[PDB]
Design a protein around this ligand. Structure first.
Ligand code: NW7
Ligand code: NAG
Length: 341
């Protein structure tokens, strides 16, 4: 179990002004730290956020959070469930800012809601340094779905923060799960992100911002455009036929037009990963993420994700029998036999 700590700086808040926080389980015999960003879509205007506050309030407020949570998948401390990092210090950061972890705007007389995702990450890091993070050798910033996009938006800022605070020896890396999307044509989204950024006062990584310039920062929410600008090592996990991608594309006995659409989506996703040396991209239709208990089951070319992550660690000290670039080439969902059911 990971136990809840509300932030000591009570000015860093969830959407409704309640304090943000983190769940922590320490492992005093380890210098590895895993900080995981929860996902859960986003909201982009007053009316849309009001609806989310009625029926998804835990994603907007800490008032009802439980005092503990169970670590599962990559957050599990049991070797049988987590062959990769079972002995690490474990941190789960709840998503209560509804801004894809991009915001830096407080509640005020002109703002009904606070959007502080980028500042929540920074304050969690600062408060952890006094609880043992100051002695870390590796800080892995991981996340799923909106949290996976959040990794891409925040990993280099964490590295810069630690350098400026005087901790040059901590190696910052990122693990982005299910957060690598395509701004493609629908079968039958980018505007919502564009409007969201203005509503949240959202921030993007600086090199990407300088490429796309004023008004075009929404481009930096798309993995294939932001990834080449990043300096920290980042491992990308993405299903070739991701269910959230297909939902926004309006895809739900398949005839020719839809067959060609789905095959082209998989080919485009595979193309965007060709120059990503650390990646795991199975040919499956899924919404499943790396904090699920059976995350060890899927394999690409005979290699599981926990193994690929271990090979990535070794590469950062190609390796015989220890691959890090694993992208399926077969062209239809479940052509990989190990896909989840
Ligand atoms: C990037 C923000 C985000 N956070 O969680 C989800 C889900 C999204 C999202 O928008 N996914 C998209 C977007 C397009 C186009 O296709 N899929
Ligand atoms: C709390 O966080 C806010 C926002 O990052 C910052 O302006 C303020 O200085 C912080 N308070 C303290 C005591 O550090």
């Amino acid at each position: 179990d990971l136990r809840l700590h509300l932030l000591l700086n009570t000015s860093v808040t969830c959407n409704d002004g309640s304090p943000a926080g983190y769940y922590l389980k320490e492992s005093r015999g380890s210098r590895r730290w895993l900080l995981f960003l929860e996902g859960g879509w986003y909201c982009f205007n007053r009316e849309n956020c009001d609806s989310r506050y009625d029926t998804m309030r835990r994603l907007m407020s800490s008032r009802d959070w439980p005092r503990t949570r169970t670590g599962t998948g990559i957050l599990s401390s049991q070797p049988e469930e987590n062959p990769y990092w079972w002995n690490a210090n474990m941190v789960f950061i709840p998503y209560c800012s509804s801004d894809v972890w991009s915001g830096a705007s407080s509640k005020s007389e002109k703002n009904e809601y606070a959007f502080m995702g980028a500042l929540i990450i920074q304050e969690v890091v600062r408060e952890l340094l006094g609880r043992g993070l100051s002695g870390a050798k590796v800080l892995l910033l991981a996340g799923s779905s909106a949290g996976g996009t959040g990794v891409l938006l925040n990993v280099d800022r964490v590295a810069e923060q630690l350098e400026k605070l005087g901790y040059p020896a901590i190696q910052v890396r990122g693990l982005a799960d299910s957060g690598w999307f395509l701004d493609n044509k629908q079968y039958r989204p980018t505007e919502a992100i564009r409007r969201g950024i203005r509503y949240w006062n959202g921030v993007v990584p600086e090199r990407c911002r300088r490429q796309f310039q004023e008004g075009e920062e929404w481009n930096c929410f798309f993995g294939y455009k932001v990834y080449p600008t990043l300096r920290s090592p980042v491992f990308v996990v993405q299903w070739l036929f991701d269910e959230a991608q297909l939902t926004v594309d309006n895809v739900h006995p398949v005839q020719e037009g839809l067959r060609l659409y789905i095959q082209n989506l998989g080919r485009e996703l595979r193309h965007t990963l060709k120059d990503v040396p650390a990646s795991f991209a199975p040919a499956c239709l899924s919404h499943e993420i790396i904090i699920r208990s059976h995350w060890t089951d899927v394999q690409v070319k005979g290699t599981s994700l926990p193994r690929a992550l271990h090979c990535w660690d070794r590469s950062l000290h190609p390796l015989k029998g220890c691959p890090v670039h694993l992208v399926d080439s077969c062209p239809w969902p479940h052509c990989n036999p190990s896909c989840p059911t």
